[PDB]
């Protein structure tokens, strides 16, 4: 659907409504909040992948 | 004349003091530096690892 139509506010309806268009379902999120999910994730995983030596001193 | 039954010999260095002669120790010192060197071997370069 999203490849066909350019309207980009259709997602997964979890409450079981008959229509997936989110204009009528009253759901809104901030841009700064959804952006930080990608930024803090992709910036952390760079650090996770760059570890080769892993030394853990037993307590 | 003697004070007692026997008299054990004195160790020159203190008991537990490690010491060694020959070319074995300097090779061990070089191998010790190479052991520390191998930890930082793949770290060198832009594509290195933390």
From Swiss-Prot, chain A:
Disulfide bonds: none annotated. It is found in: Cytoplasm. It comes from the Eukaryota. Heterooligomeric complex of about 850 to 900 kDa that forms two stacked rings, 12 to 16 nm in diameter. Molecular chaperone; assists the folding of proteins upon ATP hydrolysis. Known to play a role, in vitro, in the folding of actin and tubulin. In yeast may play a role in mitotic spindle formation. Belongs to the TCP-1 chaperonin family. This is T-complex protein 1 subunit epsilon. It comes from Saccharomyces cerevisiae (strain ATCC 204508 / S288c) (Baker's yeast).
UniProtKB/Swiss-Prot annotation, chain B:
It is found in: Cytoplasm. Belongs to the TCP-1 chaperonin family. Heterooligomeric complex of about 850 to 900 kDa that forms two stacked rings, 12 to 16 nm in diameter. Molecular chaperone; assists the folding of proteins upon ATP hydrolysis. Known to play a role, in vitro, in the folding of actin and tubulin. In yeast may play a role in mitotic spindle formation. This is T-complex protein 1 subunit eta. The chain holds residues 1 to 50 of 550 of the full protein.
